[PDB]
Amino acid sequence: RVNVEVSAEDMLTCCGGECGDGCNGGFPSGAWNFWTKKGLVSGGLYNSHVGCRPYSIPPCEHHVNGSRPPCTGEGDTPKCNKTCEPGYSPSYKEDKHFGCSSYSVANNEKEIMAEIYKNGPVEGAFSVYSDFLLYKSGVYQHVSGEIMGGHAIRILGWGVENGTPYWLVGNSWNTDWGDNGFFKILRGQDHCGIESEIVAGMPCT
């Protein structure tokens, strides 16, 4: 009944203090909470003209060389505008999709696998070190580099590569970064805290 591109714009601009601080970072569980309290409208990629509120921040080169301009490390949080783009129907208020639950999954590899297996992809977070930026393929394992900060991502599966167990992960740095926008990271030993902040939730049917 619904295959919708949920708006990142709506979450980023209208959640407020409960999710943290817009373009200056925030809280994953806070975001799932917003989905259950205020809901989220549809919204596609930068100028796709898809949905109620498409993303308004242009795509850029994330730690790689490409044809788009280079990213400039966080800019300003855009306004919380409660209207859909021109030509879209229905209105903002009626294009809202609500979640019916928001919860945290324990730091336990098996419980995280069960959650993904039964209910779908989850959101997690990990400490990004300098060596991760150049990731291309294989299973990532932090070797060296200075701490750059925390990073929230989508975990959508797992596997074993060359005997090394990993989590299949979708980054949000476009497709010219890493393995077509995805990467694998060591699973089983809370590597860079990948298993420590898993959050998820269920849609209102």
Ligand X SMILES: COC(=O)CNC(=O)CNC(=O)[C@H](CC(C)C)NC(=O)[C@H]1O[C@@H]1C(=O)N[C@@H](CC(C)C)C(=O)N1CCC[C@H]1C(=O)O
Q: Is 134 in the site for ligand X (CB under 6 A)?
A: no
90: cis peptide before it, omega within 30°? yes
Note the Cα 159 to chain centre separation in Å: 20
Site string for ligand X, 171-190 (x = CB under 6 A): --x-----------------
Smallest gap from Cβ 66 to ligand X, in A, equals 12
Site string for other proteins, 25-54 (x = CB under 8 A): xxxx-xxx--x----x----xx--------
Q: Which of 110, 112, 111, 148 is nearest to 129 (CA)?
A: 148
Smallest gap from Cβ 57 to ligand X, in A, equals 10
Q: Judged by CB under 8 A, which of 67, 72, 89, 144 binds other proteins?
A: 72
53 and 85 in contact (C-beta within 8 Å)?
yes
Q: Mark whether 171 is an active-site residue.
A: yes
Cα→Cα distances 169→47, 158, 173, Å: 25, 8, 12
Smallest gap from Cβ 2 to ligand X, in A, equals 27
Cα→Cα distances 186→23, 127, 157, 165, 167, Å: 28, 13, 12, 6, 7
Q: Mark whether 63 is an active-site residue.
A: no
Nearer to other proteins, 145 or 159 (CB): 159
Q: Is 73 in the site for ligand X (CB under 6 A)?
A: yes
Half-sphere exposure (Cβ direction) of 123: Cα atoms closer than 13 Å: 16
Site string for other proteins, 128-157 (x = CB under 8 A): -----------------------xxxx-xx
Contact set for ligand X, span 4-63 (CB under 6 A)? 20, 25-28, 62-63
Q: How far apart are CA 38 and CA 21, in angstroms?
A: 17
Strand 164-170 relative to strand 147-161: parallel, antiparallel, unpaired?
Answer: antiparallel
Active site residues: 151, 171
Q: Which residues make up the interface to ligand X (CB under 6 A)?
A: 20, 25-28, 62-63, 71, 73-74, 125, 128, 148-152, 173
